[PDB]
Amino acid sequence: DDVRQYVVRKPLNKEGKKPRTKAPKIQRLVTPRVLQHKRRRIALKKQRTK
RNA sequence: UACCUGGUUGAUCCUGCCAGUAGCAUAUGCUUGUCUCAAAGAUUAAGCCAUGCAUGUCUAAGUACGCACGGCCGGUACAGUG
Numbered sequence: 208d209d210v211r212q213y214v215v216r217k218p219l220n221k222e223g224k225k226p227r228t229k230a231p232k233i234q235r236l237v238t239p240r241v242l243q244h245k246r247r248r249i250a251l252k253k254q255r256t257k
Numbered sequence: 258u259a260c261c262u263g264g265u266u267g268a269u270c271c272u273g274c275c276a277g278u279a280g281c282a283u284a285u286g287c288u289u290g291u292c293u294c295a296a297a298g299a300u301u302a303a304g305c306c307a308u309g310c311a312u313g314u315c316u317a318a319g320u321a322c323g324c325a326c327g328g329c330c331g332g333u334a335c336a337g338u339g
Contacts, residue, residue: 209332210334211332211333211334212332212334213334214322214334214335215322216322216334217322219322219324220324221324223324224324224326224327225328225330227324227328227330228322228330228331229322229324230322230333230334230335231321231322231334231335232320232321232322232334232335233334233335234320234334234335236334236335
């Protein structure tokens with residue numbers, strides 16, 4: 208599944224502003240960036256060994 | 258600038274100190290137009306303290322669901338400022 212679609216959004220309705228839903232930033236979520244960070248760590252290991 | 262002068266005697270030459278002399282550093286007195294530097298609660302009490310201030314700090318890069326501001330109504334988690 209994809210947790211991105213199951214984050215509890217909270218509704219905000221104030222008089223002078225249009226209503227909107229606020230969502231938290233999902234933490235500890237695996238994204239392309241963290242995978243690239245792991246790749247870079249392993250590549251640094253390889254570079255050190257070489 | 259390697260300097261002395263007055264004072265013991267009726268007078269003299271000494272010893273010798275007192276006083277003078279110049280700076281320096283604190284205080285104080287009188288006086289004080291310009292201008293440049295510039296010390297300043299050490300001395301007595303490391304005595305006592307009203308009040309205020311004197312140490313805080315965020316980047317692209319730890320944590321943002323504070324509508325506190327702020328958008329592009331969305332399989333659009335997180336726009337951004339904060």
